[PDB]
Amino acid sequence: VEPNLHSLITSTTHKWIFVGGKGGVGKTTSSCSIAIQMALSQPNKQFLLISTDPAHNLSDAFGEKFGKDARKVTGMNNLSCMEIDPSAALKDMNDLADLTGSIPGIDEALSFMEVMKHIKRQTFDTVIFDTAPTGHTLRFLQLPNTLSKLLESGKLNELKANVETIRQQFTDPDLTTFVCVCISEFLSLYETERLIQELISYDMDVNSIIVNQLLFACKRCQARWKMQKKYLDQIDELYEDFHVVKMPLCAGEIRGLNNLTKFSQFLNKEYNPITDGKVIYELE
Amino acid sequence: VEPNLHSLITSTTHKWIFVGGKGGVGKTTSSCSIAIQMALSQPNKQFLLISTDPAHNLSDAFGEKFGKDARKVTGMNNLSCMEIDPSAALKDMNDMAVSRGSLLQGGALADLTGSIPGIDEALSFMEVMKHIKRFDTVIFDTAPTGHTLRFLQLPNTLSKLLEKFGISGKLNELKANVETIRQQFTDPDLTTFVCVCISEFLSLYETERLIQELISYDMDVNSIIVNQLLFAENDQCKRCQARWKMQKKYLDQIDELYEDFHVVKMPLCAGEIRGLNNLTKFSQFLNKEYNPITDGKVIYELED
Ligand SMILES: Nc1ncnc2c1ncn2[C@@H]1O[C@H](COP(=O)(O)OP(=O)(O)O)[C@@H](O)[C@H]1O
Ligand SMILES: Nc1ncnc2c1ncn2[C@@H]1O[C@H](COP(=O)(O)OP(=O)(O)O)[C@@H](O)[C@H]1O
Ligand code: ALF
């Protein structure tokens, strides 16, 4: 099973791609990267990257301002981002809205409504979700089942049909898949294993794991690599049947289309220290 | 404004302490560390560390099992942990309703509602109200920023929806409990929010936005822990030197921006920080500031 996401990046069937895992592991960095690789690789198709983390970071990552209305990434012809602000969205729908935009769960509700509107309206060929950390993303992926059972007039029936339709698409391995991102450390590895078990139980396809921030080894770096390697061995045993993609810690943060594009190549053809080592240092 | 949490750790008024920030910055590591520093220096008080992150890591961090019910940290007399379990709580509520209402009648409350987004914040909040109704200090190991903001808006949000309410008794009592929590969270002597961050663009700007949000909720925030620092000019690795250049850039901005805050600088250690011993070792630097010249050896002193 190839150690890269080339199969996903060139997929001709996938409509919904979730990128998830523990906090700070690189979900935003990776979902920007997957979205860039897909857009470059399939010029004919139109891609949306939507952040369902209420503390959005797509604008921070690209260095340009996104919002509830999809906008093209400057420099791309076929990649767009969206960051929904619930109180802004509600304030528009209402035309108390504002109080509602502050209720726990409103973020997931509006993100789901965005999915339904792409169902109803059928714009973008593929949607990539840069998700909130693990715990709240599981709640989001359960929404189709949840709404189904709760609902269980013509507009209520309309809501019902649409959620059943999402439930069916989300559980179709050709249409929907979840890419896990993790770091090779105890707290991340165990959280990721719990997440994968839960996803399998939801009948959601999960076939890929990005292991990010690897040192591939300064005494501090030598000790930290020794640790990463121990958990990396475990990841190899556990996830033998998965695409496991090993990504390096770079010499600086990864921001802007240029640097994100440069990092994203290694999701497509896997990082090789022999041939690619200099690249880590171009991010300073 | 001393670059440490000594005022907070030795405080005799604080009842509610929130530790929050962007994903993966070290909230759980720092909240365990703050709680241990407090428990150790206030032996006569009793502390509860509660994780409101639905993906809990307190058991992972100490390396032993916690749950819905508080349990002492092995090796501490003074500190307890709890990891709130939503489905479990709903299940017991449903069981007790049946055994002494459409959602309850068919015994499926947990099934129907255990997965509704927002349910974790709802139950975490119920948990808060219980310590109100009847541990001296509670430290919250919070979920990442976005959902924690929703949690912290909740008492103030409920107060206003309820205001428009205008078993009705339970709603009345909820309204009353909401008001006192709301009262206590805006009391700078009873509650404070400790921000945690790493010295990188995404974390810095998320933190800046978070703190501006908290201030508008009248929640006290006067502390920022800057975690995972390399301090590469102490001792002598190309990657570390370049990364330190990045970090130092953002640190200079943090020191300027948060001149009136306790900004507490913590080193990246040579391994993950797990178990009472390693957390305790790491935690001394919240109380007395880390000095890379003198304290540098500590990053290699973690037990396995
Ligand atoms: N492999 C990497 N090398 C260097 N910096 C990285 C790498 N992956 C992520 N980052 C940086 O790490 C921090 C966290 O990444 P982020 O994508 O925000 O994670 P998450 O979305 O899971 O919170 C950010 O500052 C990001 O720029
Ligand atoms: N200063 C540090 N040095 C080394 N490892 C650290 C440090 N702070 C946190 N960690 C490790 O970094 C990862 C994320 O920390 P964690 O406390 O889980 O963050 P958060 O709770 O904000 O998600 C964990 O593997 C933890 O052991
Ligand atoms: F990734 Al975390 F608390 F576990 F932000």
Ligand code: ALF
């Ligand atoms: F901290 Al994140 F996505 F921004 F987990």
Ligand SMILES: [Mg+2]
């Ligand atoms: Mg993110």
Ligand SMILES: [Mg+2]
């Ligand atoms: Mg945590």
Ligand SMILES: [Zn+2]
């Ligand atoms: Zn190094």
